[PDB]
A paper describes a structure:
The recently identified bacterial Sir2 domain-containing protein, defense-associated sirtuin 2 (DSR2), recognizes the phage tail tube and depletes NAD+ to abort phage propagation, which is counteracted by the phage-encoded DSR anti-defense 1 (DSAD1), but their molecular mechanisms remain unclear. DSR2 contains an N-terminal Sir2 domain that serves as an NADase effector responsible for NAD+ hydrolysis, a C-terminal domain (CTD) that functions as a sensor for detecting invading phages (as discussed later), and a middle domain (MID) that connects the Sir2 effector and the CTD sensor. DSR2 forms a tetramer with its C-terminal sensor domains (CTDs) in two distinct conformations: CTDclosed or CTDopen. Monomeric, rather than oligomeric, tail tube proteins preferentially bind to CTDclosed and activate Sir2 for NAD+ hydrolysis.
To elucidate the molecular mechanism underlying DSAD1-mediated DSR2 inhibition, we first purified the DSR2–DSAD1 complex, which showed no NADase activity, and then determined a cryo-EM structure of the DSR2–DSAD1 complex at a 2.5-Å resolution, in which approximately 60% density was observed, facilitating the accurate tracing of DSAD1 and CTD domains. Further 3D classification resulted in a map containing almost all parts of DSR2 at a resolution of 2.6 Å. The overall architecture of the tetrameric DSR2–DSAD1 complex closely resembles that of the apo complex. Each DSAD1 binds to the CTDopen of protomers 2 and 4, with the binding pocket of DSAD1 located on the backside of where the tail tubes bind. This binding of DSAD1 is distinct from the preference of the tail tube protein for CTDclosed in protomers 1 and 3, resulting in a DSR2: DSAD1 ratio of 4:2. In contrast to the preference for binding to CTDclosed of protomers 1 and 3, superimposing of the DSAD1-bound protomer with either protomer 1 containing CTDclosed, or protomer 2 containing CTDopen from the apo form of DSR2 reveals more pronounced conformational changes in CTDclosed of protomer 1 that are needed for DSAD1 binding compared the CTDopen in protomer 2. This observation suggests that the pocket in CTDopen in protomers 2 and 4 is better suited for DSAD1 binding than CTDclosed of protomers 1 and 3. Notably, in addition to the extensive interaction with CTDopen of protomers 2, the β1 strand of DSAD1 forms an anti-parallel β-strand interaction with the β strand from the MID domain of protomer 1. Taken together, these observations indicate that binding of DSAD1 to CTDopen in protomers 2 and 4 allosterically prevents the binding of the tube protein to CTDclosed in protomers 1 and 3, thus preventing the tube-mediated activation of DSR2.
Author numbering:
A (entry chain F): 11 to 126
B (entry chain D): 336 to 463, 467 to 495, 501 to 565, 579 to 636, 644 to 897, 911 to 1005
C (entry chain C): 15 to 74, 79 to 462, 468 to 629, 645 to 670
Amino acid sequence: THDLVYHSKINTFVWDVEFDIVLSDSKELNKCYFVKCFNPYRINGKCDFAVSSIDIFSEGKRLLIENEFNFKITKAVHVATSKDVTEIVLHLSERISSPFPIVKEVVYLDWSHPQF
Amino acid sequence: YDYHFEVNGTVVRHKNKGFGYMERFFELKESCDERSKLSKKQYERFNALFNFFEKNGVICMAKDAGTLNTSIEINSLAYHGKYDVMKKFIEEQSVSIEDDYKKAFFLACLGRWEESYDLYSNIILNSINGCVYYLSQINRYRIYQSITQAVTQFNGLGRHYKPFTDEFLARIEREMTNFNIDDLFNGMPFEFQKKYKILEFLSDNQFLYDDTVKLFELTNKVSSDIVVLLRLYDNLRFLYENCLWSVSFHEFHQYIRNSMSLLIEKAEYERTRDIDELGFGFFMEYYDFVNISRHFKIDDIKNLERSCSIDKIRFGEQEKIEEYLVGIAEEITKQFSANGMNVVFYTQFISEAKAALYFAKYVKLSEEGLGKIVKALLFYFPERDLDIGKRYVWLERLTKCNELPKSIISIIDDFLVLQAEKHIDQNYSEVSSNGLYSRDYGALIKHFEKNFISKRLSEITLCLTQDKQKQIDFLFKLLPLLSTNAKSHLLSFKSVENINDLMNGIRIGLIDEFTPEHEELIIEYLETRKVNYIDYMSTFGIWYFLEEINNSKMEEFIGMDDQYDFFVDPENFDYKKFIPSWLKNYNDKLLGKIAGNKHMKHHVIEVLKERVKNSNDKRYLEILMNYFI
Amino acid sequence: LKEVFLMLDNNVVECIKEITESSRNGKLVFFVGAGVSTLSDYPQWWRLVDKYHEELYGSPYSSDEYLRIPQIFYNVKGEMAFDGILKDFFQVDKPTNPIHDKILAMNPAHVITTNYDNLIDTACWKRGKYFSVISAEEDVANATSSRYLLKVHGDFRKGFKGENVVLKEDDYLNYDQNYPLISNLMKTIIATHTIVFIGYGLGDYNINMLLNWVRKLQKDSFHKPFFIRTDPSPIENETLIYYENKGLRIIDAASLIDSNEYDYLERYSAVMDLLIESQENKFITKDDEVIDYIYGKISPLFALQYIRKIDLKHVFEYDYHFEVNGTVVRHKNKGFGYMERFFELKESCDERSKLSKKQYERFNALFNFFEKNGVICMAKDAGTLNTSIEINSLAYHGKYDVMKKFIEEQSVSIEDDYKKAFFLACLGRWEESYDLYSNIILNSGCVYYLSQINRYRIYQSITQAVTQFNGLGLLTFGRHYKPFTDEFLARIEREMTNFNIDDLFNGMPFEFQKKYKILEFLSDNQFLYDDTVKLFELTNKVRSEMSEGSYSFGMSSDIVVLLRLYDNLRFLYENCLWSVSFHEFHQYIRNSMSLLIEKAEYERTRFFMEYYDFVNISRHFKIDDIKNLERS
């Protein structure tokens, strides 16, 4: 919880942790995390609404989310110190009331945008 | 200490109690009548003295100061990044030992540290005024320090590189074992230590402690900005024109980072303070652009963009900046299009390469130049440093001052087609650290043209079969660029049968308009959720508010998600279930559409007013400020 | 070699010690014999004697025959024939053996040699060392450098002539007559430096002559020279004692390692390599040694009231990082870890009793110093580290009356005057402060150097105040104030006209310059450099964190700035240094606090104010500085 950083531009948490999750189709994934990208000036289509685009990585490779990504966290491990931190994740997941509470790293595209 | 020699070239009497020779010298300089009174030997000495003082920018005394012109001119190929020219200078046979010293600095500047170490050892052998001997001893120890640091860095870190042979590594360790740079000046001839006392500071571990502590004045909130800048230029000119390898070390790079940043922040503070009282400062030049490019990291530039407004800073010598930018982009082609990559020269140059093009957002570039930078950035930049995700941002930044013309559009189209070419392999997948992919480049072209059709991509799309699935879904992110025939050909490969295929279609841009069928598919999912009541539900709600859906049978499912009913009918929504956290997830278009709804507006403006007062959140404050939501 | 060092005789390791300390001190001189030159395959003199013998009698040796046959040849064949054989024998190129490199790697102050070759000369140029090569009488006066390459027997730089060199008899007979300056220079170097003889046999003529002159010197007026013996057989015990009593400290290569009869290079290297690798090694094995080494580094600092933790990395020569939170981190200590061993004794009470009677109290003195200075343990033993900030200085707390009374008391020691002078400066009686500091200098060497620094600083303060009062004081006050009489202004100008603050440290005994390396930074604003660089780095880091709206749960990033801020205040005030009045130091304090409050306000809406924080802003902030914080 000493590496735990709360970003306030998107109400998510940055934490060096992995996730073992199961979707609504019983599929299992091990050692997976997420990365969020704040790009407020993205060239949106007529149907883009979310200000942040999130990529899910498992085993060092990004996932193509072809199905519904509703999921539950079964075991969250903090990478630097192998102590199980799942109880903190679920406690934090309820509070923020936002999709994908804990994220491996947040990328801010605002400061690099030419319209910044 | 008999006089002060100020950075603007004005001499001030300080501590001498004898005859004033500096005042007398300047009187001899201004008027030629007294010059003929000197002897012939003293006449040629005065001419040599006069040449030295005008070359070093020491013009006259403080009380005779008039229209002072302090323009920085660094006569060094190394500072300007003339990589080709120094190579030619190295190749040529060196006439004198002074040329060898310039060569060894150029070899060090070009990453050939083993050759410079050998050259510096050679110069030391043949140089026992003895000033080049001392400077070579300083530089050989410096390059030995650089080699030792690089070996440690390479052992710690993308692929295993061995630029220095272990025989060379063992040799320099045996030559530099128990080598004291501190005793170097004291062991010099006593004539040298008297004549060249000003060169002693080069043997110290740190030599910019004085310049860094004087930087504290730039934070004063009560000229000095010219003094810090001219002191910076003095340090640059001495370290480059005299070819001293300490100019590439961390202490000097950090000092330029500290001095340049604080000068920029101080000017930013003066502007805001002026507007507060006057109610409506720093002017960068070619040298400032080089200093920021060479010494600032991308993070360090990022700290600059957030703190101040460089768009308010006007850039001069833009053709010289462009010449620097076309000159640097040429070297990337030489480094990577050919097999000329120098792994040691790689590490130092790419950081300057990344910073220059990142900072190239604020400069107006000609078309022929802009093509060279874009083509070098898009194609020849290695993916390890500038990946696909970061590279577009570097490319997209160049559009701030240069609105994308046809020729640059062709280059990006060339990049997109080449990206499609690598997708013949099923294993190939774009890796982006910014969550940003080849779709974003095509969106940029469609943003700047709105009518561009990719002919070569159309040919690739029409050639597609059901087998090479990696190519099919890749070009679905490039649908607007394809022709109608290519669009019709591609659409046959995906189906929209169930609701999940609709979301996949909406995410990849497969369809941008809602035929009534998807509304029923949209409708079918919601009734199942309503039946199964006792992620997407919030997503559907926004589309109805964004006028994406005109089915008007959306109100049956009001009551499950607080975001759903918040969007379907703002007038009937209860705002005690409102959570301010949603507005942080909303993009520019959606927030603006909420602002002009004339409903929901006074509720959210109240929730934003409450949040900023209670929490003082900048994101909430800026969301409220920009769109008045 | 490390194994070889482990069972080295206690005498040899002690001999290795004194050689190494002298090398660090810059007072090591190597006396290089023909044995080192022979390693490079230089023509030995015995073959020159053989050639002279062949040209004399026609058919091809006691000690004097080496000197007599060349003298016989010189007498009957002449100078041309003598030099003709000299040229065709000695005009060769030979590579420098690694021992020449290893000799220079010892960093010798001077190199005295009896060799007439240039092998050391070219070795010096390859290494890059500058030596003023002296091989004749005129070279002594025309020496351009302090470091001397003394060829006491001459060389062939002027030419391959017999006069340029001391080869035959009547050159050793009349040596003192033809080389009075060179012989005087060699004796002076030997008297003032520590000498290591290398490449010489124990029965060499030069060694006996030097031992003959040594016996003339009074007992213990000279350092016993070191002798590297590289003969194939181990030295006899009876011969060893004889030469030790003559004045030599013998290091025997044959006793150190097992080597072949003719393998001289390995014999020379085994002592040179052992010498070279002992430079970094601290000879640190047992706990009593560990306390002794740390005490030697720390005991001089006992004169100072407080030491900056960031400055401690200079005391141990960058061996460790001494963090401001009190944690020690290995930085460049490749040998045994004495800091880890020291704290292991601190945590384990039983091992303290294992220390000897002397090393027990030395550890106790070290323990009080390290606890007072806020150095706790290593980073891996770090727990909850919370250190209250306290400054034991009357000047910091504004106890003006208490300091005024303190001046009225009679001084009981020299530190009493030094504290009084600082208080006089802090009370504006800069005249009384200056002449007091002058008195401390006369009667004073830690206090001497600090008084000189403070006296110059107060002199700069007087001169600046005088210029202000003369130039603007009349307009500012409405009256031309004259706190200093022209006699005072003239007198302090006269004394400080030629005083330079830059060379004050260099103009000190070498013992002060090594025990008090950390005090050199007080001459200029270099002592503020590390904290200024750190403050600028975290300021950009902190402001970037606030810009992006990130909040970190745990340790606060400005705690490094917060600790470094009070590290300088505690150091400057408790040591009674006038640097607290520096405009640059005030800016450093103002910038550090301003960052702290901005971060606190950023964290508050998501640190609190103490008595010490109030004083810092009161003393070091201008009115516009405080107004800027109140706006933001």
